[PDB]
């Protein structure tokens, strides 16, 4: 500080800048038919 004053760079002109941001609030609702995935329609697999 020279004589009680500091050197500072103060803006003399400005613009407005845009910045997009994506926040994920949802996801595909995946549903699985567990018996049909594992065994399809085969009776011996369903029994096991």
């Amino acid at each position: 500080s020279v004589g009680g004053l500091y050197e500072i760079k103060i803006p003399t002109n400005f613009t407005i800048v845009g910045q997009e941001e994506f926040i994920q609030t949802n996801s595909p609702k995946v549903t699985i038919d567990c018996s049909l995935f594992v065994c399809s329609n085969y009776a011996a697999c369903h029994d096991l």
Binding site: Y6, E7, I8, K9
Partner: protein
């Protein structure tokens, strides 16, 4: 693990079994540099990380916002600074 050392280090066992820790993309030295830059950003002009005012002034204005009159703050400035660096030392000495 290949330097000819005599110690069977468990990390050498892990790595030769496929379990290896890779270094982070930024070294902790770079993060240390970032933190030091963020620290000196508050103690010198333009005080880009201290609301644009000297660090001691920021401390004084922060204490004033808690209900402490400015008279004692600018009267006991050196005592406040000593208390601050003593708190920093106690934080430092707490790691021992």
């Amino acid at each position: 693990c290949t330097g000819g050392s005599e110690i069977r280090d468990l990390l050498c066992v892990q790595s030769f079994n496929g379990i290896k820790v890779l270094p982070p993309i930024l070294s902790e030295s770079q993060i240390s540099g970032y933190t030091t830059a963020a620290t000196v950003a508050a103690m010198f002009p333009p005080w880009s990380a201290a609301a644009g005012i000297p660090f001691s002034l920021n401390v004084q204005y922060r204490i004033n916002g808690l209900g402490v009159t400015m008279d004692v703050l600018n009267k006991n400035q050196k005592l406040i600074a000593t208390a601050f660096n003593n708190a920093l030392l106690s934080i430092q000495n707490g790691f021992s």
